[PDB]
Design a protein around this nucleic acid. Structure first.
Ligand code: MG
Ligand code: MG
Ligand code: MG
Ligand code: MG
Ligand code: MG
Ligand code: MG
Ligand code: MG
Ligand code: MG
Ligand code: MG
Ligand code: MG
Ligand code: MG
Ligand code: MG
Ligand code: MG
Ligand code: MG
Ligand code: MG
Ligand code: MG
Ligand code: MG
Ligand code: MG
Ligand code: MG
Ligand code: MG
Ligand code: MG
Ligand code: MG
Ligand code: MG
Ligand code: MG
Ligand code: MG
Ligand code: MG
Ligand code: MG
Ligand code: MG
Ligand code: MG
Ligand code: MG
Ligand code: MG
Ligand code: MG
Ligand code: MG
Ligand code: MG
Ligand code: MG
Ligand code: MG
Ligand code: MG
Ligand code: MG
Ligand code: MG
Ligand code: MG
Ligand code: MG
Ligand code: MG
Ligand code: ZN
Lengths: 118, 99, 144, 159, 56, 142
RNA sequence: GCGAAACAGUACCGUGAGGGAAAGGUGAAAAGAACCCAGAGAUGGGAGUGAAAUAGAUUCUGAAACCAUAUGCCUACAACGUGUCAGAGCACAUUAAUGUGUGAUGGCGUGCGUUUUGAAGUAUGAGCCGGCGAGUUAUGAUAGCAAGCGUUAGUUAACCA
RNA sequence: UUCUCGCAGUCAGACAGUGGGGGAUAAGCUUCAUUGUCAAGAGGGGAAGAGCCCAGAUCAUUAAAUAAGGUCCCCAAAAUA
RNA sequence: UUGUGGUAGACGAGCGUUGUAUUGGAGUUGAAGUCAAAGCGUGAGCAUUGGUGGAUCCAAUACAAGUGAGAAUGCCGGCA
């Protein structure tokens, strides 16, 4: 019983080739280089999901910090005032407010500024 | 006009007739869900969470996100593991803001 | 899932500015110049769209260097040849070419990037009170 | 195998100083000439052993489940010789008995010739002696016609 | 000396970018009309008004 | 409406033939003949014969005007090669590869001929999607 | 599969003993393309036969590497394991799916196996593609799991039908 | 982590702290005892680093609080005296 | 409730190829092969449609293996 390989190697090879579509030259043509690039690309994608979670936080912090310095308050004290006033809002939504709703963002800063903590 | 809701663990700023995507809520398509935790509504913002402020939403679909292939590979160590993930979501649109 | 944030789609709110470096420290002036050029102080900061305002610096030769740095700190430039390392003291830089000194100081405070070229381009540094840039109607702000 | 295939038992190239890799024969397994490393051999057994009492138990349960069921009618010598040796009569018999599609098996104790002359051009049905039927022939039947003296011989065989 | 790394199919075409051909300047004969390459005798052996060679 | 002519196993190499084919693509009939008749290259008296045969079977077989023909595409595909053994020095040997080219010239009368080719590609894609939708309708029907 | 499906121990190699290949498939039927056009001709384009000529003697199907053509996007101040996460603009419309093709720009980023305490490696192996290519069989021993038979148990080997 | 049975792999180790031997209170040296890491372990700090510090990666989230370390710009984040 | 880094290694559960035995089914109104596409799975893998192709193939339960190719300065053929 001589089992002969055909359509088994080609199908699993073409899957890797399909994944590595849009690469530079031989990186999409040859199966070997395509397989290496897909594995490396998967590693990159894994690492950059974690790094995206951190980098977008940093960007929101930067935007919020800037929005506060125009009014004379700093980020380091704004978050402290937020905690003492029990207000719980993401820096993402706060930055979205300062870019989309200047009046309501200014309302939040006014309350945290001076109103009695709790 | 606008509200800050907390569905799952994320906070969404929502306007009238706005459709946003949240984590799976175990509710059939077509029902009328009432989101409870509301942070800011109009101009009155509650410190922990506003009381009696409800966000009424209608569930549109219960689809799944794009497939993600997690390929863990330890170089020169005879370890190539592969896994796939399709995270489920639910899309809902704001209908009315309860006073 | 969640709602994505707003990012400027190649929107240019860029404006022209004027500053006077009559007695400003080199580093203290350069840090704020870089912040203004990059637009980091702007409310909406999308870090791939060079949303930063232009800047013109007047009286470059009038800037100061604290301490003995005018005679003890050296600026270095090497050509691709051997021995082409040219050195200039702080005082010599403050007299011969002061505009180049401020330009280099501002450039050093920028990230290695392909947008930093345009960012350093938007810095017009002059050694005198005069400037051919009065056609841009640049607003005047101090110590920036 | 590598030794059985006709070929040169010499080294094609020298061991060293040639740009080519080390080779020891032109009929190695990884060569196109072809020396199969293990391969099938004509000495394999393929045979298995089952105990006599285990086979008796298997036959006992298969007879029990096949018997006392539908299409397990009893047959005698009269229609075994009324066939006249013509398979047309037996086709009519299967049509009348509604056993045309069934793989009916005749279990016979005296090896009647008229029944064996027929049912031989029928790839579907077949006839066997009691000492010739097995477990597989019994449960492939889907239908069977058993002779009364065959049935008497069955209780005796079981003991 | 020999290349320690294989040259891709892109560097090859970049080098060949200067291997393109140029179209030689042609003109019309003033007695028969067929095109001939400039500053050369036509197929009829008639250059200008001078019969150079016998007709083809 | 493309008329064409072919030549299998042309002795010229594809590398040395594409250099001449790029001098005639997009050119008018008379100008292409004039350019190719006075170029001092070997692959000029063979593309000329193919071009002339293509004009003949365009204005005789396919019925084209003859004053609107332009060279649509002239290419030299890779043809079958021939292997020979060149004797080298010190007892070694190398392999000489005699290269051949499959020449094909195509001329059209319509200056917008690329659009129809893209249209046919689009039609094939549309038929595939249409088949998928009819299959989906059948699946839901049952 | 015999080295040899074909005219194979042939072609070929060696003074000699000796060593030793590759290569199959038109169509139901040659009905194998009369005839016209270009060409010196082969040949090609029509015509004709045929269900099919993109089945045409280069003759079943025709994969990849490889070489060319083209719709769409990008690219000539730019430091690049060539990808990934964000991201404008451009062009389309699908196994209707928070769609697809390209990617100005920003953040991060030194391949795969082998063998080593330790390899991006100035250690090693692979030019690319496709096929082939390395834990088997026979006779016994031990152990795990399961079934048959059981307390004067259990089970046959050769051989005969 | 004790006892019995089946199947192994391992017998080239490396560095850091601590107590010593050989060396010269030299070695990224060599040989021991002990606590850890790497080998077989990614992430953050150390500008870049197998072994140092904080810790232990099931997958997705553009959510929040923190450890070592840090808050003029590159590069997230500070002010007073 | 406690967990889910991992080489050498131990254990468990599965996918895929060819053929055979039992059942059923599809196919010149187009099977295998083969190409393309914006599908489904936790993974080996599995479908749908359209083009080419011209005659075999599929599903379930068991059984037997020349049963899984990226590396051997691996062999052969082709092409850079
Ligand atoms: Mg194979
Ligand atoms: Mg053989
Ligand atoms: Mg090219
Ligand atoms: Mg050249
Ligand atoms: Mg000689
Ligand atoms: Mg060559
Ligand atoms: Mg001879
Ligand atoms: Mg023809
Ligand atoms: Mg061919
Ligand atoms: Mg063919
Ligand atoms: Mg440019
Ligand atoms: Mg420059
Ligand atoms: Mg650099
Ligand atoms: Mg870069
Ligand atoms: Mg990038
Ligand atoms: Mg890099
Ligand atoms: Mg391997
Ligand atoms: Mg070594
Ligand atoms: Mg070593
Ligand atoms: Mg290197
Ligand atoms: Mg070496
Ligand atoms: Mg070695
Ligand atoms: Mg090598
Ligand atoms: Mg290979
Ligand atoms: Mg046993
Ligand atoms: Mg030791
Ligand atoms: Mg030792
Ligand atoms: Mg020590
Ligand atoms: Mg000591
Ligand atoms: Mg010591
Ligand atoms: Mg040591
Ligand atoms: Mg080791
Ligand atoms: Mg680490
Ligand atoms: Mg670090
Ligand atoms: Mg864990
Ligand atoms: Mg905090
Ligand atoms: Mg701290
Ligand atoms: Mg900062
Ligand atoms: Mg594990
Ligand atoms: Mg099968
Ligand atoms: Mg098909
Ligand atoms: Mg095998
Ligand atoms: Zn003339």
């Amino acid at each position: 019983m001589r089992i002969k390989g055909g359509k088994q190697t080609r199908v699993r090879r073409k899957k890797w080739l399909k994944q590595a579509s849009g690469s530079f030259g031989t990186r999409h043509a040859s199966y070997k280089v395509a397989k290496q690039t897909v594995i490396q690309a998967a590693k990159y994608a894994y690492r950059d999901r974690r790094n995206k979670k951190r980098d977008f936080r940093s960007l929101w912090i930067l935007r919020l910090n800037a929005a506060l310095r125009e009014q004379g308050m700093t980020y380091s004290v704004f978050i402290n005032l937020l905690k003492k006033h029990n207000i719980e809002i993401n820096r993402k939504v706060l930055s979205e407010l300062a870019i989309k709703e200047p009046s309501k963002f200014n309302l939040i800063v006014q309350k945290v500024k001076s109103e009695q903590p709790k | 006009m606008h509200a800050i809701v907390v569905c799952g663990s994320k906070q969404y700023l929502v306007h009238e007739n706005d459709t946003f995507f949240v984590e799976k809520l175990e509710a059939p398509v077509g029902k009328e869900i009432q989101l409870d935790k509301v942070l800011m509504l109009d101009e009155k913002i509650g410190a922990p969470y506003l009381e009696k402020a409800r966000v009424v939403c209608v569930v549109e679909k219960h689809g799944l996100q794009r497939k993600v292939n997690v390929i863990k590979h330890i170089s020169q160590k005879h370890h190539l593991k592969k896994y796939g993930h399709r995270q489920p979501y639910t899309k809902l649109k704001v209908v009315r803001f309860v006073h | 899932k969640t709602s994505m944030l707003t990012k400027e789609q190649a929107n240019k709110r860029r404006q022209w500015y004027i500053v006077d470096a009559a007695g400003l420290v080199l580093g203290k002036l350069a840090v704020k110049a870089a912040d203004l050029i990059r637009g980091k102080n702007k409310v909406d900061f999308t870090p791939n769209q060079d949303c930063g305002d232009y800047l013109i610096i007047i009286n470059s030769d009038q800037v100061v260097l604290t301490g003995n740095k005018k005679e003890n700190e050296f600026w270095y430039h090497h050509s691709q040849y051997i021995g082409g390392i040219k050195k200039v003291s702080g005082r010599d830089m403050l007299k011969k070419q002061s505009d180049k000194l401020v330009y280099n100081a501002v450039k050093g405070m920028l990230p290695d990037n392909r947008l930093s070229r345009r960012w350093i381009t938007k810095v017009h540094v002059f050694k005198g009170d005069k400037h051919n840039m009065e056609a841009q109607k640049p607003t005047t702000l101090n110590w920036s | 195998t590598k030794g059985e295939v006709r070929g040169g038992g010499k080294k094609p190239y020298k061991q060293k100083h040639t740009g080519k890799a080390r080779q020891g024969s032109t009929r190695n397994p990884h060569f196109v000439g072809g020396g199969i490393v293990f391969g099938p051999k004509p000495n394999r057994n393929y045979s298995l052993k089952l105990n006599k009492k285990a086979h008796t138990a298997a036959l006992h349960t298969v007879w029990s489940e096949k018997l006392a069921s539908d299409n397990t009618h009893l047959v005698d010598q009269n229609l075994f010789n009324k066939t006249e040796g013509k398979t047309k009569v037996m086709m009519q018999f299967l049509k009348s008995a509604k056993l045309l599609d069934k793989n009916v098996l005749f279990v016979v104790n005296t090896l009647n010739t008229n029944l064996e002359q027929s049912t031989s051009n029928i790839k579907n049905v077949q006839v066997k002696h009691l000492d010739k039927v097995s477990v597989r022939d019994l449960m492939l039947a889907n239908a069977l016609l058993v002779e009364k003296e065959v049935l008497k011989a069955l209780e005796g065989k079981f003991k | 000396a020999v290349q320690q790394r294989r040259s891709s199919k892109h560097r090859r075409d970049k080098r060949r970018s200067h291997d393109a051909l140029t179209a030689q300047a042609l003109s019309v004969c003033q007695k028969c009309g067929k095109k001939k390459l400039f500053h050369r005798v036509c197929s009829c052996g008639m250059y200008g008004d001078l019969r150079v060679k016998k007709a083809y | 409406m493309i008329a064409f002519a072919k030549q299998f196993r042309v002795r010229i190499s594809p590398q040395k033939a594409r250099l001449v084919c790029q001098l005639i693509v997009g050119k008018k009939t008379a100008d292409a003949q004039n350019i190719l008749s006075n170029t001092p290259k070997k692959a000029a008296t063979l593309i000329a014969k193919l071009l002339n045969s293509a004009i003949a079977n365009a204005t005789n077989n396919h019925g084209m005007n003859g004053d609107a023909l332009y060279v649509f595409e002239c290419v030299a595909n890779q043809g079958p090669s021939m292997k020979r053994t060149i004797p080298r020095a010190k007892g070694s040997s190398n392999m000489i590869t005699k290269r051949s080219s499959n020449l094909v010239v195509k001329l059209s009368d319509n200056p917008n001929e690329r659009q129809e080719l893209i249209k046919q590609q689009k039609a094939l894609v549309k038929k595939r999607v249409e088949g998928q939708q009819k299959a989906k309708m059948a699946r839901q029907k049952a």
